[PDB]
Structures are given as C-alpha cells and as structure tokens.
C-alpha cells in the first residue's frame, strides 16, 4: 500500500462503506506541515486523500473534553466533560482518570456517534476512546474494550481487522481507535525533539499496519478512514511558570494547576455557591506589567470558546499565555496542552481517505464540533442535537448526504412615515433651524432599493426569534432593524467605502439628538432614561461621522440607533468606529458593518427571553446588553467592494463584552491605540456565534450554496 499509487472499490458482501475514526493524541498540525515526508504511510494518505491545514480543537485542549466533543458535536459545557479532572456539586463526587468515577454515566451527557448509530440500526465497535468504555445513556457499544495504555498498537489494529472479518449481521459499520502517541513523547521531551519523531514514526507504522491489513481484505479503497487528533503541543520550562504565591499572602483554595487553571473552594458542597469568585479575579487583575496570564469570570470569557454554562466549570477561571504554566505553590520540563484552541501550537490534524471523500483535496481549517455531523452523513444516519453547523462540511465529500437550507424567519417585519412632526418630544432636543432633515428620513421606492443595495448587499438578517415585534427602518447611509419591545435596534447594516489618506476625520455632532417620527412614542427610547443613570449613557450603534458631509450625519442623531452603553465601554466603542474601522476599510477596500446588542445573562450562548434579562437601565423597562457584536464583511479578492462583489466573502466578527470597567484591557498607562485593538482581537467569534446570541441569521440574499455560506459562518480568523 505504501509503495502503491493513488486510486468505490468495495467487494461483494459489503454494501455500505465502513467508517474508522483513528485518533493520534497530541498530533499537532506542525507535525504534518514539517515532518510529513518522514512518515511514508501518512504522507501517502495526505497526498491521495483529503486533509486540512489544521483542525481547530476545543478549550481546554485536553484528551477527554476534545475526544468526547468529536463523537458528540457538543461543546465541553454541553456534553459535561469540561476537564480530565473535575468536580460536580449536585452529585458530590470527583472525576479523575485514576478514579473509578470515570465509568459513572452521570458525568457523561449528550449522545455519541456510536450510540447514534446503534439507535438507528447500525452496529458500532470501539478499541479505546474516552466514553466508549463507559455506559453512556445506559447502553454500551456492540464491541467495547476497557482502556489499557500499555497495549501494543499492532494487536489493537489486528483485532479491529478481525471485526471487519465478521459476517454482515454481526459486523459493525462504525469504528474508533485511540493511540497515546505523539502526546506521551511531547510531555517527555517537547514538540521539537527527536523523541516525538520516533513517536510519529511509531504512529505511521501503526496506521501502515491498518492500511496493509485493509489492502489484503480489499477494503483499503472502500473504508472511509478518518485519522485526526484531539489537540497539539507547546514547549514548557520551569522558568516559564507563574506562581500563585507571588499574588496571594495565603492560599485557602483548590486550584486545577496547568494550562487551563480553575479556582475552587476547599469546603464543598456548602461553601461552593457562597465562595467569593469575583474577589479572586479582582486580586489577580493586572498585578504585574509583565504578567503571563489574565483572570476571567465564566460569562466574561470570550464567547467563541463556549466555556461557562456547566456547574463543573468554576466561576473563576485563568487564561494563561503561550508556553507559560500556572501552579498553586513553588513545588514542567518538556511540553503540555490545555491552552487556548486559537493558538498555532494547539492546532490538531485532520486526514481522510475513502470513496465518500474528495481525492487530492486540501480543505480550509474547521472546528472539531463539525466532525460528528460528517460522521452521521458517512454512516447515512440522522444526527442528535449538536452544536456543529450541519452541512458546513459538504465540500469535503464527493456526494453530500445532507443538503442544508436557509434558516426560516419566525417573525415578520411590520413603522411607516406619515408626517414629519413628532407627537412626543421624548425629553430630547437639538440646538439647531426647521425640520428639513425629517423629510430626508422619508425615502421613496427607488431610494429604499438604493440603500438596500449599497448598505444591505447580502440581505437583511432574518429574525429567527418567535413573536419578536420589530420594524425595518431605512436611511440613506444605513439600514437598521428596530426591536419595538426592547426600544433599541437588534441590528444595523452599513457599507463604509474605501477612504482616502484622511489624516483629519470629521467629528461627531455634540448635544444634538432628536425624536423618531416613524417609531411610536410608546415603543420609543427617551433621553431622560439616561439622565437618572450616571453609570450608563446613550450610545449610537451606527457612527454618524463615517459617511457623507456634515448635513448627512443628522439621520443617526435620533431616538432610534440609541443603545445603552457604559462610560468606560464608550472608550472602546468610539475609538473602534473612529480609528480602527477606517484602518481596516483601507486594507479590505471598503467594509460592510452589521452591529447590534447581545443579551446572555444566563451565559448559555443563546439569546435571552425578556424574563432571562436581569439588568435594565435605572428605573426603566429598556434592557442592558451583556455583549455587543460587530460583523465586518468584505471579499476574498481585494479588487471588489462589499456593496458590489461577485465572489467569495471575507468575514471578521466580534463579540465585545459590555462591562462597566475596562479591567480586562487594563487602560492604566496605555493609550487607547494599545488596548482597544487587543480586546477586540481577543473577542473575535464565528458568524454562527453572533447568530445564536441574537437569533438573527445573516447572508440569505447571497448568490452562493447554503453549504458554502456555512463555511463563512463557521470561519474563525486567526492572526
Ligand atoms: N478511554 C480512556 N479511559 C481512561 N483513560 C484514558 C482513556 N483514553 C486515554 N486515557 C488516558 O488519558 C491520557 C491522555 O490524557 P491527556 O492528554 O488529556 N493528559 P496528560 O497527557 O496525562 O497530561 P496533562 O497535560 O493533562 O497533565 C492517555 O495517555 C491515557 O493514559
Ligand atoms: C475531591 O478531591 C479533593 C482533593 O483533591 C478534596 O478536597 C479536600 O476537601 C476537604 C473538605 O472536604 C478540604 O478540607 C481539603 O483541603 C481538600 N483537599 C485539598 C488538597 O485541598 C475533595 O473533598 C474531593 N471531593 C470528593 C467528593 O471526593
Ligand atoms: C470492563 O470492566 C468492568 C468492571 O470490571 C466490567 O464490568 C462488569 O461486568 C460483569 C459482567 O461481565 C458484571 O457482572 C459486573 O457487575 C460489571 N461491573 C461493573 C462495575 O460494571 C466489564 O465487563 C469490562 N468490560 C470488558 C469488555 O472487559
Ligand atoms: C449545544 O447543543 C445542545 C443540544 O442542542 C444545547 O443544549 C440544550 O439547551 C436547551 C436550552 O438551554 C436545554 O433545554 C436542553 O436541555 C439542552 N440539552 C443538553 C443535552 O444540553 C446547547 O445549548 C447548545 N449550545 C450551543 C452553544 O449552541
Ligand atoms: C437514551 O436512550 C433512549 C432509548 O430508548 C432514547 O430514547 C433517548 O433519546 C436516549 N437519550 C440520550 C440523551 O441519548
Ligand atoms: Ca441566554
Ligand atoms: Zn490528548
Ligand atoms: Zn497529553
């Protein structure tokens, strides 16, 4: 097989292609992009078959959360396995690799692929996998095997080939195989060592034994083999470790030491809920200028990670930088994993071979949460509710099983111009003159279609929320979707064109703010609402001084486009729309911005119901957003503008947390140009992430297949 050339070639007896999920622990993308030629069998698979540049892991980048994420399609917070070592309050038990509690079905949530196959009339066998040796939802896989890390790989492969020798009735359709290397060698020496090469050569022979075995069984060109990894590897040193003793006078708390630290109380389960978690982050927030970590609360963490809604995730969490560790006391060598999944060193591998997959194709990077949807499509089975976008991975397959469709709108738009005179002043006034700008808001059929072409190129974001009373408001420079109930816009779409050298930019008009004649005063936001609240003040979603002359910016300064913002948050919001937005408009040759509020007080990752919202503006029914999104959209080819682009798009979304203090960025000593960009970049999320938090599906009028649009939806930009 290793000497053979690139080729369904399935023989009689086998009617459907079998799926094998090969896992090589700690096999980073760096290993495949540098040492691939040293691996004869793996190099023959990357050339003939299909492979990605890298496969994005899930935080924390460890075996048990990632392996179980691949088989379920759920985030660690949803499937329960948030860490290899964790504690449950309600069950009052400790989960550990050495403990017997690993076999307890109460820890394991969701439905893995092997069970999904069994519930749909397909047998599933497994030779090692975190969860396969556990009775998830009562049932066990058809051929499960109790874990033993010291078993030789040749015997593991031999028994898997023996399962394929079984007759059609007893013969399983789905398989999984786990390998400890090149992870064990990564901890022993490091990611750039001779030790990992020997382990990489050892996994190559192990994969070689499977392909050579399948060759004599005439299944090497029939089997849909998927060789992937859980995480990557990063070098560590005893000099590159942050000690907690240098931050606290006395340690009276339990900490999960390593790349993903979690602070918990010792007295459990009584003092768990009453433990002052917000105190620890406050005592760790920018204590040193050369600090190698950042303390975070569960909802304060970047939304893209999806690591908050689970009782096992301790409220106080630590975000350690690249190559650096965190320990409780003074009492390391080689390498480790558990860091941010966005990091280059934590990028896993993905390689596939078979008749279902496209031959000699190098696909773009994707998240492990999507593997479950692909596995279901390969086995011809309906998936269980997972967090992966079904249909996103159709570009990998020659013949896609699931054809995705656009998200159905559950709420119809129904605001209209009648007279330019306002019924109620709403305690707001502009010093400037007669009401001439009020008639400019009133646009004819042609003028509406003009702004629905320039500022709305991919169409209006459809409301996926049930009974959401909303109205569409049109302006010459921006189109917005006002939310009648929350008295603020859900979204605001506007295409900023490519500007000149622009050394001096026009400033925003101060003290000028009028009332909207289209929106009814009962559903309108009053300026007196922010008068009583000293902490929160009126902020505009769409910046007025971004398009046109001094007269044109009068449309934004109205009761509409007004959203509640903190005085400290405005420093991040205004600087981004005055310096950064223009800077990235030059690089992309114009940019389409879709911005709005996010309500996620229950930190589940989904949009909040009116009852779910806990904080409102002082003595008013207008809510306060938890986060604010900014979706920047352009094109892959820089020659075209977002208003008129034929081809593939380029996206840069954000989920900026709406916090009363900039304690996350730490603005002390640093000028706005040194921390605003850094925070936005740290809070970059997928288009699917903004969609789930708002209940607004984007890009529905874009002339491209639903499968191709989902690739942009799942896309996460990495710098
Ligand atoms: N199904 C399983 N059941 C129990 N233990 C397993 C199973 N699969 C793998 N393991 C064990 O989990 C290890 C991989 O876990 P990890 O890579 O997540 N953690 P490790 O390398 O020990 O170091 P840390 O950075 O977490 O300190 C393997 O080497 C096995 O010993
Ligand atoms: C889980 O294991 C930890 C130890 O790893 C246990 O923590 C101890 O809990 C007692 C109170 O019950 C404290 O006084 C000790 O200080 C804790 N130990 C350490 C090392 O800090 C915990 O009780 C275990 N939980 C269960 C349910 O087994
Ligand atoms: C994996 O190990 C477990 C625990 O040793 C085995 O489970 C036992 O199975 C027998 C029947 O074979 C039952 O009578 C026991 O009650 C089970 N114990 C527990 C704690 O579940 C299991 O059979 C082993 N599986 C394999 C494939 O070796
Ligand atoms: C990931 O998917 C799961 C399943 O679709 C979601 O979990 C469900 O969420 C609803 C609403 O909160 C609950 O009523 C269900 O009980 C949950 N089920 C399970 C098994 O957890 C989860 O919210 C999704 N997460 C994201 C980020 O999309
Ligand atoms: C558990 O198994 C039963 C079998 O009847 C099934 O109906 C149910 O959906 C399963 N639940 C999960 C969470 O897999
Ligand atoms: Ca929510
Ligand atoms: Zn691992
Ligand atoms: Zn490991």
Numbering used by the authors: 140 to 146, 151 to 474, 478 to 560, 562 to 579, 585 to 871
Report text from the authors:
We therefore created an inactive mutant of NPP3 by replacing the T206 nucleophile with alanine (NPP3T206A). A transfer of the crystals to 4 °C and ligand soaking with concentrations of 10–20 mM for 20–30 min finally lead to the observation of AMPNPP coordinated to the active center. Despite the somewhat limited resolution of 2.9 Å for this structure, the inhibitor is well defined by the electron density map. The AMP moiety of the AMPNPP substrate analog generally has the same conformation and interactions compared to the AMP product binding mode. However, the nucleotide is positioned by ~0.7 Å closer to D276 such that the carboxylate group of this residue forms a direct hydrogen bond to the adenine amine group. Due to this shift, the α-phosphate group forms hydrogen bonds to the side chain of N227 and the backbone NH of T206 in addition to the Zn1-coordination. The β-phosphate group is also coordinated to Zn1 such that this zinc ion is five-coordinated. With an O-P-O angle of 178° the leaving group is almost perfectly positioned relative to the T206 nucleophile, which was modelled according to the AMP-bound structure. This indicates a catalytically productive binding mode. In the AMPNPP binding mode of NPP3, one of the free oxygen atoms is bound to Zn1 and the leaving group oxygen is not metal-coordinated.
All NPPs share a conserved zinc-binding catalytic domain (phosphodiesterase or PDE domain). NPPs hydrolyze pyrophosphate or phosphodiester bonds. In this extensive study, we determined the crystal structure of NPP3 from Rattus norvegicus in complex with a phosphate ion and various nucleotide ligands allowing us to characterize the substrate recognition of nucleotide triphosphates, dinucleotides and nucleotide sugars by NPP3. Similar to NPP1 and NPP2, the structure of NPP3 consists of two major domains, which interact via a large interface of 1279 Å2.
